[PDB]
Ligand binder design. Structure first.
Ligand code: ADP
Ligand code: ADP
Ligand code: CO
Lengths: 243, 243
């Protein structure tokens, strides 16, 4: 029930729209989304997360936000804040086709003035996650994949999808690429690891990052204490003009 | 088209029907299925795998069977053999509602005389993987799960499912439970690990196994050379009267 000119007034308050996308489920798209939100918050930035992943909404759980409950104000649907860093979150989860659902999330929600809105897309390169790009029209987008995914095929379906809304492909994230023994700091690289950097060099993408399988990230993910995860795999995420 | 009394003549040639099942996707159900097939073959046994996982058929890939071509004989639909150990495989994959598809797989396929038929179910505890239990009515079934999401809930939906066809729950497999540094042989246990043994003791299941995250299993899985995977996580899988 929200006009195309209506969202404009809302997104005008938002410095930069990043979308996070994946070849498929279980590659840690929502976890990365969360870690980028945490990166930005901790740098002093005001951050919003829109959970577009109706399939399996990981986002609220990661911030221990099962206390769903949206409330309505002058400004509209008040997003629930993460207690440690004040990140604003919106998820279907907070109500116990979607073409228009995203239009509401961009319309009726009081995002206020924030520097970055992170959209946790549905998984894959299908129509589902393209419908969301239709309405969110992001400035930037970030590919999340495991080594043993991460083909030029996938990366090209990704660059092509980003064409349909004119969005820059800012980075590849190689999630669960290696493991670092905490005893002896030995790394063991999972088969297919190192492809992110080669494909990035290949298609002229400027940001690569290889996130290991981290027991602590799994612990705190589960506990919903992700805001306390110390390691920043986005230490070197490039600046992005966000006025 | 295959009659209910028709399958009887076929399964009469088959010593024991094991079904492999999961709380959800990406927990390595198909990989375990494959490793149990390999365990049995290498022990001298004649083994069949029915790939009931139409969703995302991992099985043929694991044995490098993209040569997906069935042929028909007197005996019927000839399963394609794995080249190293002679395991017989059947998968929709070999043709480039399913209620009756499984009925064909159990009916029209020439399984011949074999000791074990392993059924790689669809993932989860939903209707999909229950339809297959209807027609396969397995003697035994094995739960595959990762630590994070190995709940009494899941295990009970599993024991309950197995009731509906009177099948024994033979084992729990905790897949990707830990990692062993190849430098210093240190193990690092993923959060939630050790639950399989507690739940098994709890619901009186006789077989537990914890499979680590294995770079080599990932390598050979991908290469489709799984038959050459040396480690047997079923070293101590109990005997099962299979006349
Ligand atoms: N680097 C990592 N180390 C350990 N666990 C991880 C890592 N990345 C993701 N996970 C876990 O893997 C699972 C899948 O991540 P998730 O974000 O749900 O993927 P997706 O967004 O594709 O569904 C979750 O349990 C998540 O916390
Ligand atoms: N213990 C393990 N170590 C490393 N990789 C594994 C392990 N178990 C499974 N995998 C890999 O994880 C992925 C998921 O396994 P799969 O059997 O396809 O899950 P499911 O059958 O439940 O969909 C595959 O790439 C598989 O080879
Ligand atoms: Co070590």
């Amino acid at each position: 029930r929200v006009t195309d000119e209506d969202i404009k007034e809302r997104l005008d308050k938002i410095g930069f729209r990043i979308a996070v996308m994946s070849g498929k489920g279980g590659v840690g798209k929502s976890t990365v989304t969360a870690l980028l939100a945490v990166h930005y918050a901790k740098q002093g930035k005001k951050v919003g997360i829109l959970d577009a992943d109706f399939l399996g909404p990981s986002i609220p759980h990661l911030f221990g936000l099962e206390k769903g409950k949206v409330a309505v104000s002058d400004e509209g649907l008040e997003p629930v804040l993460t207690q440690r860093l004040g990140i604003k979150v919106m998820s279907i989860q907070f109500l116990l086709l979607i073409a228009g659902m995203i239009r509401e999330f961009l319309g009726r929600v009081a995002w206020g003035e924030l520097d970055y809105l992170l959209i946790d897309l549905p998984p894959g390169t299908g129509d589902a996650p393209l419908t969301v790009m239709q309405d969110a029209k992001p400035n930037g987008a970030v590919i999340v994949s495991t080594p043993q995914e991460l083909t030029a095929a996938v990366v090209e379906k990704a660059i092509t999808m980003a064409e349909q809304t004119k969005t820059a492909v800012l980075g590849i994230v190689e999630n669960m690429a290696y493991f670092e023994c905490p005893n002896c700091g030995e790394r063991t690289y999972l088969f297919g690891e190192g492809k992110a950097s080669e494909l990035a060099r290949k298609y002229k993408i400027e940001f690569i990052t290889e996130i290991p399988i981290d027991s602590d990230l799994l612990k705190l993910s589960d506990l919903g204490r992700v805001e306390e995860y110390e390691p920043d795999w986005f230490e070197f995420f490039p600046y992005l003009e966000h006025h």
